[PDB]
Design a protein around this ligand. Structure first.
Ligand SMILES: CCCCCCCC(=O)OC[C@H](COP(=O)(O)O[C@@H]1[C@H](O)[C@H](O)[C@@H](OP(=O)(O)O)[C@H](OP(=O)(O)O)[C@H]1O)OC(=O)CCCCCCC
Ligand SMILES: CCCCCCCCCCCC(=O)OC[C@H](COP(=O)(O)OCC[N+](C)(C)C)OC(=O)CCCCCCCCCCC
Ligand SMILES: CC(C)CCC[C@@H](C)[C@H]1CC[C@H]2[C@@H]3CC=C4C[C@@H](O)CC[C@]4(C)[C@H]3CC[C@]12C
Ligand SMILES: CC(C)CCC[C@@H](C)[C@H]1CC[C@H]2[C@@H]3CC=C4C[C@@H](O)CC[C@]4(C)[C@H]3CC[C@]12C
Ligand SMILES: *[C@@H]1O[C@H](CO)[C@@H](O)[C@H](O)[C@H]1NC(C)=O
Lengths: 84, 804, 40, 145
């Protein structure tokens, strides 16, 4: 019941906040160390928010061979206790 | 209609001599001349956009000689070139070489093969032709219509279109000539006088193909509106005005990457409106489960659907896959025949036995292959028919009734019942049997088949237990009178070996090893290869006993003292009572429901849309044939048969050609089933061959068929999905559009139905299985929508596997 | 047939012909009845 | 007068639009003060959601066709031709990578090269139309290869 319909990266707003609006309004360009906002859309209404939050993690990878030791891959949960 | 001929200036191959050669001709419809020397298939003319664009350009500044008083090509060309110069279209220095080109020899199709063929040529200031410099494009009309004259009315007049390329020209030029009187020229061999002359000369230029230019001019002349305008035009502008209307009513079709018939037929109103506009100014005027409400309508439509394919039903069997399927289904229909005939002879005191079942199966299969609308069905005895035979024998022995005469009267009632059902199109009730009942019945029947094969192996083990000591001097006639060493273990080894070899060759068919065609061949004969290997294995072990196939000694009744080949309906030894002549309808009723359900559900399963059967299936003809043949065979003391599910599914699977995981086509033909029936009939005379075939090899074959028949059942797939995690679940509509627990509730309800039917089959009241199976139709149609949405039912219970 | 059998007045072809005739008669009766209905 | 397409198809989107789809806007109008008809072709650097023209998908291409009343110039039909040209796969790909007008004109010529003209024929419509099926298939056997 946690299917994903779409994810909006909000390229215009984030690029405005991250001083990359001159680059594009469609591609997400962000600068490290500063938060950016995305919107996750679900196919069905989410009944219980906390178990669903416990059920989801995010992974960011860069390069052809991403790994933790190279710091080219990070897996982090979606929670208010995350290291900002 | 008029004759239009298009000739192009070309140079030959033997003497390199330029000349005029006809490239196409028009009698409304256009014919083209191929390189071989024959005319292609006539077709409606289609023009390139560039040809019409250039034709309009040259016609706008063209040269018109209307009502010209000349009767020879020399006279026309002299005047045409004289006004060409007067119109400043060609220079006077060009007149000499252009006149030489026009009055040349005009060859036709009768001398293409006599000469060395033609190649395109460009006229030079020198007499010798220049080889064209622009990139050559082979004519689309020749590739599409050519690589493989009485229509001219007596009063009709002809038109000659001449196209030629000359490098010594500034721009392409059009000359239009209408003679005062239609005359015969040496250019056209046909005895039709020429009224119009199109001359299209010019240099090699981009976007100008002079063959297409001539085709456009000839198509314009072939049009009725322009030709009437051409006859009545006294100036160039009137011809120009008619050309503009021709282009105004033309339909340009842009390129598309996904062509289709339906999108093309969306332009039918456009084509009709354009034709209406063109003729608005001219004086011419433009020239299998449905119920039909008719008696025997379903039967007649069933015949008309399939009988035209009779020629293909013989020629499509000329493949080794069909022979391998014959060898497969021969054993698959012969071993159950022997087993059921032996059980019938044991129960009915040999009144109906192995030979009767064999001959009935042979005759009915031959007739069904020759006359059935779905020849892929296998017609033979089944379990419920055996249960009915035992029940009727018990009833007849209870009240002192002759069993075979009661069978005769049951068949007599069956004929009336099937005639009434077919005459009222009663087979349209089959449409209420959705995927639910079909898959439940198929899964239950396959499970029963597997269970019975394993039970036969178990019984072999019980008859020959593994023990420390054995009696060695045991009697061997007619069967083991005691336990034997190495018998059960060798039966297990043979069954496992033949099943393993069949599965290995099945995977070899889909594997990537060996030449693919050889692998496809070897894989097609996989079951015969496994059978031969294990038969040889048992052959080379001589000391050990294994039970072998046994056929009747000859074509004789199974019990000589009880009955003959023909049964008297009034009685054999005692007079048959009057009341049973009428009371035979109720057992005939039950037999009719059994046979109807089995045969029509088998037809539904085999002829599913996902199985890629394009030849059609007849639900009225096959039921009539099967039940009528059973009713007739009852009069001869022979069993009534039915279209069994496992044998027919195996027969269809053995004729299925796989694509490159996806069903490609099925070899639907009448020869495979006919040969299986003939071999079943001939099996009595094939005793020295069948007597060396063990039953364990056939048991492994039965296990293979049982595990193979589950491939196309969505119920089996969903049962697997019960043991399979949701993330793994495949991309199918009943997974992606239905919740996993809802799908599993659907599967669990189907499982409960399967358990109920298995329990019913386990009781002596196993003849009520058709009615309990029927009860699954009110289930799906009433109770299932009370707990499932319409979307969920469309996704799960889909007729053609569609996502609603 | 076989062995010793009771001799009826009708032979097997005669009795099966009369039964086929009776069946054709009742079939025609039902067909004519169905043709009468759905029309009036 | 009413357009032919309206008369033959109108007297009697987001679901079908693919997700990664970009819009082409064709603007057609008649201006009597212009001497000549003019064509404008615009490929945006990136697809944009123009607030003045809200579309189901962001606009990537703009066609502007303006001009006076001229012989044989139907501006609605001219816009239909430019729209069909955009709908064709090969020209659309060429338009995405086009860097000059000449490359666009080369693609239009190839579009015209693989174009079939059905003249006014007296044949039955279902036979006249279906006769184009093998001719068009042969004509497009290399364009989409
Ligand atoms: C049994 C042959 C005995 C070996 C004799 C030694 C000679 C011998 O058989 O090898 C040369 C020959 C090469 O010929 P070639 O490569 O042209 O033959 C290919 C082969 O038939 C494939 O099976 C085909 O694929 P598929 O399956 O139809 O899809 C493929 O067609 P396609 O589909 O790609 O267009 C064919 O092109 O065969 C082999 O392919 C190597 C396998 C060796 C076979 C060895 C098996 C033990
Ligand atoms: C894919 C191919 C098939 C694979 C499955 C193998 C099933 C083999 C049949 C076993 C059940 C059976 O039949 O056992 C039942 C028999 C019979 O017992 P009874 O007391 O004589 O019967 C009583 C009935 N009376 C009174 C009429 C005699 O037990 C035995 O003799 C015990 C020996 C069993 C040998 C098992 C062989 C190894 C199996 C494991 C292989 C992986
Ligand atoms: C649908 C089929 C089975 C027909 C229905 C059976 C009934 C209606 C008919 C068919 C043939 C008939 C029989 C034909 C001939 C005779 C001989 C006569 O001396 C006594 C009655 C008797 C024995 C008839 C009884 C009724 C009968 C049994
Ligand atoms: C015991 C074996 C044979 C079958 C058991 C499978 C059943 C119990 C399991 C397998 C997959 C499971 C489903 C997987 C995912 C979801 C989505 C979740 O948001 C609600 C529950 C639901 C819908 C589960 C319900 C229970 C389920 C259907
Ligand atoms: C054949 O029928 C007779 C008499 O009807 C019976 O006695 C005999 O047992 C039967 N034969 C067999 C093999 O059952």
């Amino acid at each position: 019941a946690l299917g994903i319909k779409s994810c909006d990266f909000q390229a215009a707003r984030n690029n405005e906040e991250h001083h990359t609006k001159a680059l594009s309004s469609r591609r997400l360009f962000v600068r490290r160390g500063q938060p950016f906002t995305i919107i996750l859309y679900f196919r069905a209404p989410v009944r219980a928010f906390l178990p669903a939050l416990k059920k989801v993690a995010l992974t960011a990878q860069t390069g052809e061979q991403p790994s933790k030791i190279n710091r080219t891959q990070a897996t982090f949960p979606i929670s208010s206790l995350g290291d900002r | 209609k008029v004759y239009v001929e298009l000739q192009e200036l070309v140079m030959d191959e033997k003497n390199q001599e330029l000349r005029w050669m006809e490239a196409a001709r028009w009698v409304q419809l256009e014919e083209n001349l191929g390189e071989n020397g024959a005319w292609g298939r006539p077709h409606l003319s289609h023009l390139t956009f560039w040809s019409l664009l250039e034709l309009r350009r040259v016609f706008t500044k063209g040269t018109v000689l209307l009502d010209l008083q000349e009767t020879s090509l020399a006279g026309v060309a002299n005047q045409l070139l004289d006004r060409f110069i007067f119109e400043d279209q060609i220079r006077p220095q060009d007149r000499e070489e252009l006149l030489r080109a026009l009055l040349l020899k005009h060859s036709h199709a009768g001398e293409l093969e006599a000469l060395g063929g033609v190649k395109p040529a460009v006229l030079t200031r020198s007499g010798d032709p220049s080889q064209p410099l622009l990139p050559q494009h082979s004519s689309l009309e020749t590739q599409l219509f050519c690589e493989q004259l009485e229509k001219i009315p007596p009063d009709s007049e002809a038109t000659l279109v001449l196209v030629g390329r000359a490098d010594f020209l500034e721009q392409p030029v059009l000359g239009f000539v209408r003679l005062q009187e239609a005359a015969e020229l040496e250019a056209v061999e046909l005895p039709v006088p020429i009224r119009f002359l199109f001359v299209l000369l010019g240099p090699e230029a981009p976007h100008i193909d002079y063959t297409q230019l001539g085709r456009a001019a000839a198509t314009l002349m072939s049009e009725r509106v322009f030709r009437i305008d051409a006859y009545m035009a006294q100036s160039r502008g009137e011809l120009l005005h008619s050309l503009e209307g021709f282009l105004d009513c033309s339909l340009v079709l842009p390129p598309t990457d996904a062509p289709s018939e339906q999108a093309l037929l969306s332009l039918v109103p456009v084509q009709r409106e354009l034709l209406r506009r063109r003729y608005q100014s001219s004086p011419a005027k433009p020239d299998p489960l449905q119920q039909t409400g008719q008696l025997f309508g379903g039967l007649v439509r069933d015949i008309r659907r399939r009988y035209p394919y009779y020629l293909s039903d013989i020629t499509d069997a000329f493949s080794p896959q069909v022979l391998a399927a014959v060898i497969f289904i021969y054993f698959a229909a012969l071993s159950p025949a022997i087993t059921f005939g032996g059980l019938l002879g044991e129960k009915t005191r040999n009144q109906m036995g192995v030979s009767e079942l064999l001959i009935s199966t042979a005759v009915q299969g031959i007739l069904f292959a020759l006359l059935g609308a779905q020849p892929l069905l296998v017609v033979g005895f089944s379990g419920p028919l055996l249960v009915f035979e035992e029940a009727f024998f018990s009833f007849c022995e209870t009240n002192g009734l002759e069993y075979i005469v009661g069978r005769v009267w049951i068949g007599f009632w069956l004929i009336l019942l099937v005639v009434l059902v077919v005459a009222f199109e009663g087979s349209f009730l089959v449409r209420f049997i959705s995927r639910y009942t079909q898959e439940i019945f198929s899964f239950l029947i396959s499970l029963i088949f597997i269970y019975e094969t394993f039970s036969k192996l178990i019984k072999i083990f019980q008859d020959h237990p593994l023990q420390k000591t054995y009696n060695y001097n045991v009697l061997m006639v007619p069967k083991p009178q005691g336990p034997l060493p190495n018998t059960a273990l060798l039966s297990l080894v043979l069954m496992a070996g033949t099943f393993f070899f069949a599965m290995m060759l099945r995977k070899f068919k889909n594997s990537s090893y060996f030449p693919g065609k050889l692998r496809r061949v070897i894989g097609d004969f996989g079951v015969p290869i496994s059978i031969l290997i294990m038969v040889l294995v048992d052959f080379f072990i001589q000391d050990t006993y294994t039970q072998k196939l046994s056929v009747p000694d000859g074509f004789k009744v199974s019990n000589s003292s009880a009955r003959g080949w023909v049964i008297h309906p009034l009685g054999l030894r005692s007079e048959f009572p009057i009341w049973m002549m009428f009371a035979s309808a109720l057992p005939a009723l039950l037999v009719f429901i059994l046979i109807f359900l089995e045969s029509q559900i088998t037809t539904l399963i085999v002829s599913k849309p996902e199985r890629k059967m394009v030849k059609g299936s007849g639900f009225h003809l096959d039921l009539l044939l099967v039940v009528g043949m059973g009713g007739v065979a009852a009069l001869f003391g022979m069993p009534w048969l039915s279209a069994t599910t496992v044998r027919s599914v195996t027969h269809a699977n053995a004729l299925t050609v796989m694509g490159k995981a996806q069903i490609q086509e099925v070899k639907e033909q009448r020869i495979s089933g006919l040969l299986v029936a003939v071999l079943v009939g001939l099996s009595i005379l094939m005793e020295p061959i069948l007597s060396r075939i063990p039953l364990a090899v056939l048991f492994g074959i039965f296990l293979y068929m049982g595990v193979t028949s589950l491939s196309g059942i969505q119920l089996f797939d969903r049962i697997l999905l019960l043991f399979k995690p949701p993330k793994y679940h495949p991309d199918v509509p009943y997974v992606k559009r239905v919740k996993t627990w809802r799908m599993h509730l659907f599967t669990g309800i189907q499982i409960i139905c399967l358990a109920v039917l298995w329990v019913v089959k386990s009781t002596p009241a196993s003849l009520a299985l058709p009615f309990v199976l029927i009860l699954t139709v009110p289930l799906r149609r009433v109770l299932l929508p009370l707990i499932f949405r319409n979307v969920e039912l469309q996704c799960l219970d889909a007729d053609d596997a569609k996502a609603t | 047939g076989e062995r010793v059998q009771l001799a009826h007045h009708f032979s097997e072809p005669e009795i099966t012909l009369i039964i086929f005739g009776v069946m054709a008669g009742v079939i025609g009766t039902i067909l004519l009845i169905s043709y009468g209905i759905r029309r009036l | 007068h009413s357009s032919l397409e309206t008369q033959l198809f109108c007297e009697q989107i987001l679901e079908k639009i693919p997700p990664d789809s970009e819009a082409t806007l064709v603007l057609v109008g008649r201006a009597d003060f212009l001497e000549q008809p003019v064509l404008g072709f615009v490929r945006l650097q990136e697809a944009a959601e123009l607030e003045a023209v809200e579309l189901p998908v962001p606009i990537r291409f703009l066609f502007v066709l303006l001009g006076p009343e001229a012989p044989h110039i139907d501006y609605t039909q001219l816009g239909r031709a430019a729209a069909t040209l955009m709908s064709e796969r090969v020209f659309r790909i060429d338009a995405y990578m086009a860097q000059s007008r000449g490359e666009l004109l080369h693609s239009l010529e190839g579009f015209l090269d693989c174009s079939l003209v059905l003249p006014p024929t007296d044949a039955p419509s279902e036979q006249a139309l279906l006769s184009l099926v093998p001719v068009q298939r042969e004509l497009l056997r290399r364009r989409y290869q």
